[PDB]
Amino acid sequence: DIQMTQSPSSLSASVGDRVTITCRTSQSISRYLNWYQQKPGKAPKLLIYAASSLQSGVPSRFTGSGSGTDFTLTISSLQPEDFATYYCQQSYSIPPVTFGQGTRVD
Amino acid sequence: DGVGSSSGNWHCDSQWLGDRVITTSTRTWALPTYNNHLYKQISNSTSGGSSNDNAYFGYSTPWGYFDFNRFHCHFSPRDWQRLINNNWGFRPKRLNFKLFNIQVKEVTDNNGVKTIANNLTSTVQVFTDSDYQLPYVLGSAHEGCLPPFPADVFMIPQYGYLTLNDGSQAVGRSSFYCLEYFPSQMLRTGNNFQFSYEFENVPFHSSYAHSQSLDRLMNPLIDQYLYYLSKTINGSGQNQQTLKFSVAGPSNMAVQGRNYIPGPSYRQQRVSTTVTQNNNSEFAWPGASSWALNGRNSLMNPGPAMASHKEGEDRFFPLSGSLIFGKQGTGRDNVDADKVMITNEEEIKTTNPVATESYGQVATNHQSAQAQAQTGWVQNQGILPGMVWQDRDVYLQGPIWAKIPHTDGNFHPSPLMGGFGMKHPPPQILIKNTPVPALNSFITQYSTGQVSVEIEWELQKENSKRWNPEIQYTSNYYKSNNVEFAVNTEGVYSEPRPIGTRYLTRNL
Amino acid sequence: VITTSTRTWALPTYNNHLYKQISNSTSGGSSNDNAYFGYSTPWGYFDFNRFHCHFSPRDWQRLINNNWGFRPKRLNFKLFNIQVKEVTDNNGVKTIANNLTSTVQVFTDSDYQLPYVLGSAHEGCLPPFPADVFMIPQYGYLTLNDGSQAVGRSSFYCLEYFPSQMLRTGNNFQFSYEFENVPFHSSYAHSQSLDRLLYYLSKTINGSGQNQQTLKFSVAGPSNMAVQGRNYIPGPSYRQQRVSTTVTQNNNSEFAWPGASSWALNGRNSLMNPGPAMASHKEGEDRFFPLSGSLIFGKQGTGRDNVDADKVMITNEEEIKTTNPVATESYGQVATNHQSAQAQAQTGWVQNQGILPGMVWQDRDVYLQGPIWAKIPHTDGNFHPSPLMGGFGMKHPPPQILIKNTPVPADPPTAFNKDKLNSFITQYSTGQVSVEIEWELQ
Amino acid sequence: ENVPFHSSYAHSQSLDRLMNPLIDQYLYYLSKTINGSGQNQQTLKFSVAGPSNMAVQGRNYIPGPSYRQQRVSTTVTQNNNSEFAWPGASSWALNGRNSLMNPGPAMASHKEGEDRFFPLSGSLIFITNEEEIKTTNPVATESYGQVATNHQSAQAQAQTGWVQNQGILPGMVWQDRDVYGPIWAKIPHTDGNFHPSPLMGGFGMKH
Amino acid sequence: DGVGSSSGNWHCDSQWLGDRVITTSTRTWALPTYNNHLYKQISNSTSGGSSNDNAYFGYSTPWGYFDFNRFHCHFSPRDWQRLINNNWGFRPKRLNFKLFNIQVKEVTDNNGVKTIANNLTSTVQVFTDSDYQLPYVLGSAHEGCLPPFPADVFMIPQYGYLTLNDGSQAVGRSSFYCLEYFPSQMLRTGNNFQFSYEFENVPFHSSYAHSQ
Amino acid sequence: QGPIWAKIPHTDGNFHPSPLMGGFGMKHPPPQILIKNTPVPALNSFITQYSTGQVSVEIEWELQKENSKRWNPEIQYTSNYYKSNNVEFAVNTEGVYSEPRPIGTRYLTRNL
Amino acid sequence: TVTQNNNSEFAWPGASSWALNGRNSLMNPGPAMASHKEGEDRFFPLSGSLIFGKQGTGRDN
Amino acid sequence: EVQLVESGGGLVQPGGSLRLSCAASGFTFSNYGMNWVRQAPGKGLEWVSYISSGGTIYYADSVKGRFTISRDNAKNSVYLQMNSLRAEDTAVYYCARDPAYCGDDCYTIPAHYFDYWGQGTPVTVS
Ligand SMILES: [Ca+2]
């Protein structure tokens, strides 16, 4: 089971700031990394799939980059709307899909 | 007839008449000059020839050729739906070909600016090989066929052929063909060309899936009058040998006597769609089923017609068993699995063995008091009397016909990539621009024209007494950014998925 | 020869005039190999597909002694003297009375639109003895399944959706059928053998020692007949395990299913039975028989389950050993390598062999108790369509003949109710069937 | 009686070269199963089958059937120093008696470039060679090809096996044996036969 | 014609010919005796009539009737699929009706055990109203039509009708219909009944969805 | 499952008489077919009696064929391939016939 | 989805009807109208469409 | 648009059994693979089980042998039958769609990333 660790477990930021979240995996998962945000009580929504791509219907500010063991999610021009927990999951080794512990943005 | 008079009209449509379909397609083509009007010997060592399995020898010619041998040339996606949902079978009958509105251009490069103008006195040469005296390259599933979407303008492919070789060198038996040594009709901008062809009798392609399986043909309510060997021992111990016999009946259906057995198999390696499940080694060529000819290994592709996977195992696919098509805009080399469309023939599982499974088991010895019964797996099985099988399916993107090689013998000549095998298929149609000398110096020149092909198809209507409704091919009901089988915002036409012909059902 | 058989039949009411989904689930047998899905129908059907229906043991003797071959030509079928009985159980005992106005429905499937079950060698044929009265078997069919479940490609047939002829007690039914041209069944044993109908390599070494390699060639002649060149080779083989009629000789283990030769289709294993036509045993061994490779008939009164070897009749194919390989033997040997100064010639046994150009073979023999015809499945291709249990394979075999008692309801309620009627009069029918086949002789 | 004309020509093309060398196929093949390097590098990469790689292209027809012969060199020092004429012979058993397979199914006597080898019982010896048919027919001394013997998995590597004999498959073509030799043969009187043309060459006839 | 001779055969199938479809359905029916051979005035107050919107007045009759007015009577699910996927419109043209193999039974209750036997001399009365003089109840989406599956045996529904009312009472304009006052063909177990009908010209039903 | 025809009420006027539950409105629809058992007196006392018979109906339908020039494929009515306990529009194990869903007639398309 | 509906009995009170000679009849199914807007599949007209029973469905409630 | 709404859930005694359903609308349900994932209260996301269009089924190790996943395409529903529930099974279970779908005649390449989810249902084992 691939283990995933998002580095800044908690993050504090203000509107307009550049936020950067990264996770690392124990074994290479190639380019298969997916990012989710979850607001408290809501169901999570897919933001970025396949490491660097972007899901339809989601703001352009979100970006992703990485391969192998290092992937990064970078929120640009942070707004009031996107303070949430963010999760990174890998669709490479299946079964089972694994998820990151979670990172909070304040 | 004249420079200012059109030599033909635009015909595209389908006429559904009773048991027949008549499809007509008209395209606009552009023919360049190939090889600067030269025949050139080609071989592998020119490209470096690093592998003996890839070694070839042959010739490239200045001529081009017209290829209509894919189904989406003749059928819109709606006409293909109208075909496969309502019909148990089809096959071609007549062919009618026309080449018209010829236009020859001349190209001049003066400093940086090119300039193109009409050359009204230039000719185009065209002939068909109706005695089949040239090497026949149309049954190899090559690119360069008329585009599926009628508004696309396509480039005519260059004709070439291969002959015998040893390494990259030739042998005494190798043949050379000058295509100028064929009489050919010459055309100026007012001339047109046409010919008609009669398909030779072929069996109807079966566009249906069986509603029964080869091993379930029995009446489930009634015993057989045959007996089978149920027990070789009475129980645990020594010297328990016995012979017991039971009626083969509804309760044990595996042991019943059967009149017919599934068709032949040549086993394929099994590859999984989910990548981690596959072995961590390079087995694409090493673990592949192949056949050897004169010391060269050729991959077995797609091979004998076999079911792609067992019931309930969608992820697995035979390594070279299925036809794989590219999606619109897919690269040439090392594209990902989501850039290709892997067709799966799971509908032939009823009569055909699974491609990735053994055909069965045989006994490998004589049992005795000192020897247990031993069995072994049949990895490949040739034809046995009493076998039945289905051929491979045809697709909207797939080939139509192949030429049956001219040989002493063949068995079930139906071609392995799908379609109709023929000893005299539609003939090759060769075309070139006649060289105009400015002798190795010529006027830079190309031509353009409209080509229309009409084919008459015979239909086999569905007679079924089935009570419940069939499976049908259908478009998706819900919203999406684009319409499937339409253009996008940039004007690119795409075929979203491969479409097979087998929806309606029959009894086995 | 023109054979004619008349019998008397009794037709019950099957499934209380209902179509019913059946599967291994309803039966309760879990195994994947035996899983099935299908339907049982209220209809019965006539089956004359065994030879002893049309032949007396004398006629069969008269046929096989004097003739090299035979094959059916025409068919004629009649159904007459229909009698419909009603059964009324009042308290203890039941009374049977004629119902004059009741009907019996019959039709032939002459477009071959129903599943064809007459090629599976089933009970319920016309009995071999003309004074026997037989029960008509129930019609049912199987469809595609996954486990005990149907898939979307599974089909359901309502036989009521076929036009049928309705017969009261005075009406009769008949039709005639033309067999399609089929090859004469061979009913003879070849006197000669395939191998007993130019140079060869005699010696690869001069003698014992080192560097003795040589090539010597000798004439092929009557002295050594194994090495002579031949134009034809024996037919295909798929090996069967060998079993002995003397139980002591056989291994002390349960190898009946484990040791069986079979074929896999969509993940389910089926026994290879009887399989390709092969010789039952070598010359001189009558105690060995192939495991699944022969037809096995029950003797009169033999039980259904686990009966000893003296209760069953095991046929043997030894007649065809001239052109066909033995079922329990390998086909031959092949070279597995390239010999060299460093490597000895290696060989391996051919356990199964498909068709090769130049093969000749014999089909399986037909028996007085055995089947006559089968339906060739409707497919893109087939090879030597002759059925593996014996007989004449046909794409348009004699059609199925389906028959049921027309349901007669009991008294309905006095106020309207939209439900279908589940209350019917207990009823059955009986009558006569005659089937005439014209045979051509060689 | 009516019989097929004996072919007295050698194919100028081989069954695996029938393609147009200048053009790609519209079909793809599986080029790579691993990205490269070491652990956890599984992928599926596909490429167009084209002139650069002619082995992996899809083909409509395949070579004829084979029953392998042991290979014997005309140079005696090359051959194994043992008696293998009978022991290392390809044979077929009938009723418990072994017949040598002679001459056997029609196959190419040797690969292109090796003229010093011949099938043990493959060619008629008055030593003729069938090399003309190497275009549509497999070599007599070679395997027909390879088949997979297992399901690969993350645990199990892909395994192949050599096909020593191969019966008829749909889509095979082949050439019969050449005539030099006999003319006609009688087809045995049987329920069935396949491609009755006799194996020593010439015209098969039911009469 | 006779007691032991069938008066008709079983016809079920569809024939797809060009621009036409011919569907044939055959069912087995059972007709009881309704109202003990009586005409009976019915209204709401017999059932208690608590609501004025539900108030009715009319008559129930001993007669039954045949209703084939639903589509699954004439079409299997496969024939319906074959219709709707390939065609922009359809409409009926001709109608052909047959009633045959009549069987009349008699029921006797002796102590607890019932006994049923044939009554060969009994008749069944059948007529069609082709002048449309009776109240027409077939266009009210009622139950009692031939079953969709051909192997089902169905019960014939009881005919009844409504006329004018005020509350549960009648008015002077209300009409009463005796269905015996119609000539009707009488049938014993050897007789059969048939008639043919020509649909009047109607527009095609539009079986398509607009794409704009 | 729906109705086929209705009878257009006999009135001075109507507008677009097509019936509101669906189907074909007609001034002279298929006529009613009335049936009863003739009373057999044992007069209020009778023999308890019922009848049973076979009924057959045949309709000829005229079709309007689809002429469309649409390039892409239509929506069609289809069965679902995936495995299930029962076949849709078939009997179950107890022999009961069911119609799983209501099926409309509108799949093919036209221009407005 | 029943919790989206008002918490009251409106089957008869809120229904569209027509009156004839002082008797109210429900308007069923009524003029032919689209059942719902594009994108809303969970709403249906109160008496707007034809409702069929499944096999074995009871008579009441 | 695409909607997933799951029902079931609520209190169950340890060792008990519960059946979660997920009703889908706005897309053709039979074309897509469906997933159950669960989030424990005050805990991270965790994947439970998968079923594809053609019936490939996966389970997580912690859950295997106990829960069973199935789908009914006539009702547009995916079911999770949870047996032998334990106090670690307390979570909010979500239904998530897998976007991958090529067609009837070709293999689909499973994406194993979830574009659309349910609102969740709580399951409390006590
Ligand atoms: Ca397919």
Residue type, B224: Q
> Inter-chain contact H73–F80, Cβ cutoff 8 Å?
yes
Q: What is the DSSP letter of A54?
A: -
C319 assigned to a ligand binding site: yes
Residue B20 DSSP SS3: strand
Question: In chain D, which residues have their Cβ closer than 8 Å to the Cβ of B42?
Answer: 21-22
CB contacts < 8 A, A to H, total 51
Residues 6+ apart with CB under 8 A from E181: none
Using H for helix, E for strand and C for coil, what is the string for chain H? CCEEEEECCEEECCCCCEEEEEEEECCCHHHCEEEEEEECCCCCEEEEEEECCCCCEEECCCCCCCCEEEEECCCCEEEEEECCCCHHHCEEEEEEEECCCCCCCECCCCCCCCCEECCCEEEEEC
Q: How far, in Å, CA of C442 to CA of C119, rounded?
A: 25
> Inter-chain contact D90–C212, Cβ cutoff 8 Å?
no
Short-list B57, B6, B65, B149, CA closest to B493: B149
Question: In chain F, which residues have their Cβ closer than 8 Å to the Cβ of C146?
Answer: 83
Q: Which of B314, B337, B479 sits opposite H53 (nearest CB)?
A: B314
Task: Please give the sequence-ordered ranges of beta strands (E in DSSP) within chain A, or none if there are none.
Answer: 4-6, 10-11, 19-25, 33-38, 45-48, 63-67, 70-75, 85-90, 98-99, 103-105
Question: In chain C, which residues have their Cβ closer than 8 Å to the Cβ of F56?
Answer: none
C263 assigned to a ligand binding site: no
Structural biology method used:
cryo-EM
**Angle at B257 (CA atoms; ends B256, B263), nearest 5 degrees:** 105
Strand partners, C205: C213
Residues 6+ apart with CB under 8 A from B489: none
CB contacts < 8 A, A to B, total 6
Name residues 26-45 of chain C within 8 A of F (Cβ).
26, 39
Q: How far, in Å, CA of D34 to CA of D38, rounded?
A: 9
Contact (CB, 8 A) for E71 and E80:
yes
**Ligand 1 center to residue B394 CA distance, Å?**
9
Radius of gyration of chain F from Cα atoms?
Answer: 23
Q: How far, in Å, CA of B251 to CA of C262, rounded?
A: 18
Q: Does A27 touch chain D (CB under 8 A)?
A: yes
Which residues have beta carbons under 5 A from ligand 1 (an ion)?
Answer: B 347, 500; H 105
Question: Which helix (H) or strand (E) element contains residue D146?
Answer: strand D145-148
Q: How far, in Å, CA of C116 to CA of C397, rounded?
A: 10
**Ligand 1 center to residue B494 CA distance, Å?**
20
Strands of the sheet with A63-67, listed across from one edge = A4-6, A19-25, A70-75, A63-67
Q: Which of B81, B470, B483 sits opposite F74 (nearest CB)?
A: B81
Rounded alpha-carbon distances, angstroms, from residue F42 to C411, E119, F39, F48, G56: 18, 13, 9, 9, 40
Q: Which residue of G has its CA nearest to F96?
A: G55
Tokens 């972007």 found at? A54
> Inter-chain contact F22–G55, Cβ cutoff 8 Å?
no
Q: Does G56 touch chain F (CB under 8 A)?
A: yes
Question: In chain B, which residues have their Cβ closer than 8 Å to the Cβ of H56?
Answer: 312-315
Q: Which of E18, E80, E85 sits opposite B472 (nearest CB)?
A: E85
Angle between helices B77-86 and E77-86 (to 10 degrees): 160
Q: What is the DSSP string of C2-20?
A: EEEEEEEEEE---TTT--E
Q: Which of B78, B470, B477 sits opposite F73 (nearest CB)?
A: B78
Q: How far, in Å, CA of A101 to CA of A7, rounded?
A: 10
**Angle at B381 (CA atoms; ends D28, D177), nearest 5 degrees:** 90
Rounded alpha-carbon distances, angstroms, from residue C156 to B209, C37, C151: 15, 11, 12
> Inter-chain contact C101–E189, Cβ cutoff 8 Å?
yes
Percent helix, strand, coil in chain F, to 5, is 0, 35, 65
Question: Which helix (H) or strand (E) element contains residue E78?
Answer: helix E77-86
Tokens 């088991």 found at? B361
Q: How far, in Å, CA of D88 to CA of D119, rounded?
A: 11
Q: Which of B13, B470, B474 sits opposite F75 (nearest CB)?
A: B474
Q: How far, in Å, CA of B260 to CA of C261, rounded?
A: 15
The binding site of D consists of 53, 86, 129, 132
B285 assigned to a ligand binding site: yes
B51-54: long-range contacts, CB 8 A cutoff, minimum separation 24? B51/D55, B52/B167, B52/B295, B52/B296, B53/B296, B53/B297, B53/B298, B53/D54, B53/D55, B54/D52, B54/D53, B54/D54, B54/D55
Strand partners, B491: none
**Angle at B247 (CA atoms; ends B244, B252), nearest 5 degrees:** 100
Residues 6+ apart with CB under 8 A from C352: B362, B378, B381, C236, C237, C238, C239, C331
Q: Which of D69, D126, D185 sits opposite C231 (nearest CB)?
A: D185
> Inter-chain contact F78–B469, Cβ cutoff 8 Å?
yes
> Inter-chain contact B264–D169, Cβ cutoff 8 Å?
yes
Question: In chain H, which residues have their Cβ closer than 8 Å to the Cβ of A64?
Answer: none
Rounded alpha-carbon distances, angstroms, from residue H73 to C152, F87, F92, H23, H53: 11, 13, 18, 10, 10
**Ligand 1 center to residue B91 CA distance, Å?**
19
Q: Both tokens of residue B470?
A: 């069939």
Q: How far, in Å, CA of G55 to CA of B324, rounded?
A: 45
> Inter-chain contact B469–E77, Cβ cutoff 8 Å?
yes
> Inter-chain contact B465–C120, Cβ cutoff 8 Å?
no
> Inter-chain contact H105–B343, Cβ cutoff 8 Å?
yes
Question: In chain F, which residues have their Cβ closer than 8 Å to the Cβ of C19?
Answer: 91, 95, 97
Question: Which helix (H) or strand (E) element contains residue B77?
Answer: helix B77-86
Short-list A102, A83, A100, CA closest to A39: A83
Q: Which residue of G has its CA nearest to H23?
A: G1
> Inter-chain contact H108–B273, Cβ cutoff 8 Å?
yes
**Ligand 1 center to residue H103 CA distance, Å?**
10
Strand partners, H49: H36, H59
**Angle at D142 (CA atoms; ends D141, D143), nearest 5 degrees:** 135
Q: What is the DSSP letter of B48?
A: T
Q: How far is the first Cα of chain A from the last one, in angstroms, to the nearest whole number? A: 31
Q: How far, in Å, CA of B414 to CA of B403, rounded?
A: 10
Strands B380-381 and D71-73: unpaired
Q: How far, in Å, CA of B403 to CA of B157, rounded?
A: 19
Interchain contact H/B (3 or more Cβ pairs less than 8 Å):
yes
Q: Which of F26, F34, F49 to mutate to test the interface with E (most CBs of E within 10 A)?
A: F34
Tokens 């649409």 found at? F70
Q: Both tokens of residue D60?
A: 């409509």
Cα-Cα-Cα-Cα dihedral of B407, B411, B413, B415, to 10°? -110
**Ligand 1 center to residue C391 CA distance, Å?**
35
**Please, how many CA atoms are within 13 Å of residue D155, restricted to the half-sphere of its CB?**
2
Q: Does D87 touch chain C (CB under 8 A)?
A: yes
